[PDB]
């Protein structure tokens, strides 16, 4: 903690490079697409809300899926099995009270069996070689939040929202590290709510400037603008909740003025 803030930040920066999925992996998957991946993650978002899981669990589960799919070629009828095993693994890693396995079996409306989920759980662990302590956008965001002059709960919730949105679209977002997406999401959230900008103190912490974040920020800005029009809407619905200060109802800026 605050004796280790910087040690931890440094270490997460080295680990996010190690745990990065391969950018081009969907090209290499014969039977699945970005679009099918989007469907899975959006379902996982609903599972998350149905079981009241941490946002961290969600971010980990997606990290496991992207890494699993970086090395293992998967049929469309099995994508949701991978996703269930990932989310179960994520919950055991991160939740105080993980849902029991039967609850994971149940949420896949009798598509698969308990024995299948548990064998997939095993295969996932083998494929990831047990490297479950992956850094996520969530873990960086939470650190960046400490640099708000007045802490603003709307900035925080909106940052998480934009962070979550970027989980859905592999196309652009797989090319950016969690620390860079978080940077872009924090600045975009700051700007939208308060008119403020990526704070100088985060430049000294991360070494990132508005200039270095710009590419991701260009993509995230568009994703924000087009959010109500996306085929997948579970995140928008999720962040309508008072628990997240209804930040998905806030209006995006039309320009970033960069």
């Amino acid at each position: 903690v605050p004796d280790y803030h910087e040690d931890i930040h440094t270490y997460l920066r080295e680990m996010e490079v190690k745990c990065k999925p391969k950018v081009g992996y969907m090209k290499k998957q014969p039977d699945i697409t970005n679009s099918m991946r989007a469907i899975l993650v959006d379902w996982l978002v609903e599972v998350g809300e149905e079981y009241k899981l941490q946002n961290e669990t969600l971010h980990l589960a997606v990290n496991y899926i992207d890494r699993f799919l970086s090395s293992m070629s998967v049929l469309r009828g099995k994508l949701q099995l991978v996703g269930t095993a990932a989310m179960l693994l994520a919950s055991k890693f991160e939740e105080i009270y993980p849902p029991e396995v039967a609850e994971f079996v149940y949420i896949t409306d009798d598509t698969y069996t308990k024995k299948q989920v548990l064998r997939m759980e095993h295969l996932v662990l083998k494929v990831l070689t047990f490297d479950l302590a992956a850094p996520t956008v969530n873990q960086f965001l939470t650190q960046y939040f400490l640099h708000q002059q007045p802490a603003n709960c709307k900035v925080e919730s909106l940052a998480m929202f934009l962070g979550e949105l970027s989980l859905i679209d592999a196309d652009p977002y797989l090319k950016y590290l969690p620390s860079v997406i978080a940077g872009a999401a924090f600045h975009l959230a700051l700007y939208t709510v308060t008119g403020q900008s990526w704070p100088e103190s985060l430049i000294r912490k991360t070494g990132y400037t508005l200039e270095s974040l710009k590419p991701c920020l260009m993509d995230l800005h568009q994703t924000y603008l087009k959010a109500p029009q996306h085929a997948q809407q579970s995140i928008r619905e999720k962040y309508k909740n008072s628990k997240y200060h209804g930040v998905s109802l806030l209006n995006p800026p039309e320009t970033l003025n960069l």
Binding site: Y11, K92, F93, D131
Partner: protein, 297 residues
């Protein structure tokens, strides 16, 4: 998979795992094998094993018992650990007539603080430091073991499992059910262990949460808003708690010198925020002359 290992004897046991001393037939290396039982028709791989393994592969440090390998099987999970000859409690039970010499205590403390500062700077809480989980070899190394209860923490932490740390080594913020606890809980446990190394008896041997709390209060004084801002706001704080006066610290652990007492008092600070960090404690004058004395077993 297990064909290169040769079990020598059963050595200990957990809730899922049985631990054997074993030997690598090809390299000759003596290792500890933790056999973890797996059930298909239940819950799968236990979360304790999921955390112990993933956290332990990140923690390579001379004072953290090293996970050498994980051996799979559709039925079983075998963890291969570096082997150490005993735990700290057994060493203390066998030092029970003469005591542990101060050079050795200083060396052990300094090594533990190193392992602990390595965990915290890698965002890991151990959450079960007690002398049974601290293994010692014949070279005078001591190392942290059993990461079964550990967890990866986030930077402002959030609320984690409350049911945490063996009672005697459990910190007051956990006892008072704070919303948030952090690295300071491990330091509290090491404080207790530091005291226990000196006298060879537990510092706060309670029987319940309230009993544990009252034993702490009677030794360190009952905390008020002065010593610990927010204490009276804690979820399990009660205004009816007896008010004990803080004792002379030289009576808490009589054989300790000024530096030791100073260091111990920083590890047993009520307020998690002022309690010393493992990192900061490495530079304490208590350790100005630390050697690594290699005991006599």
């Amino acid at each position: 998979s297990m064909e290169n290992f040769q079990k020598v004897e059963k050595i200990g046991e957990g809730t899922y795992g049985v631990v054997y001393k074993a030997r690598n037939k090809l390299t000759g290396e003596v290792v500890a094998l933790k056999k973890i039982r797996l059930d298909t028709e239940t819950e799968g791989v236990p979360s304790t094993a999921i955390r112990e393994i993933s956290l332990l592969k990140e923690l390579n440090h001379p004072n953290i018992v090293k996970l050498l390998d994980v051996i799979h099987t559709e039925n079983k999970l075998y963890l291969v650990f570096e082997f150490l000859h005993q735990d700290l409690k057994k060493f203390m039970d066998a030092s029970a007539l003469t005591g542990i010499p101060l050079p050795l205590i200083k060396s052990y403390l300094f090594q533990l603080l190193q392992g602990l500062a390595f965990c915290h700077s890698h965002r890991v809480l151990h959450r079960d430091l007690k002398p049974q989980n601290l293994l010692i070899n014949t070279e005078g190394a001591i190392k942290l073991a059993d990461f079964g209860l550990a967890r990866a923490f986030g930077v402002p932490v959030r609320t984690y499992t409350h049911e945490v740390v063996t009672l005697w080594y459990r910190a007051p913020e956990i006892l008072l059910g704070c919303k948030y606890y952090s690295t300071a809980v491990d330091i509290w446990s090491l404080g207790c262990i530091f005291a226990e190394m000196v006298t060879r008896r537990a510092l706060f041997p309670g029987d319940s949460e309230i009993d544990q709390l009252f034993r702490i209060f009677r030794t360190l004084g009952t905390p008020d808003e002065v010593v610990w801002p927010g204490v009276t706001s804690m979820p399990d704080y009660k205004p009816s708690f007896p008010k004990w006066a803080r004792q002379d610290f030289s009576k808490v652990v009589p054989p300790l010198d000024e530096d030791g007492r100073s260091l111990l008092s920083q590890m047993l600070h009520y307020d998690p925020n002022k309690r010393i960090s493992a990192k900061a404690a490495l530079a304490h004058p208590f350790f100005q002359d630390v050697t690594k004395p290699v005991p006599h077993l």
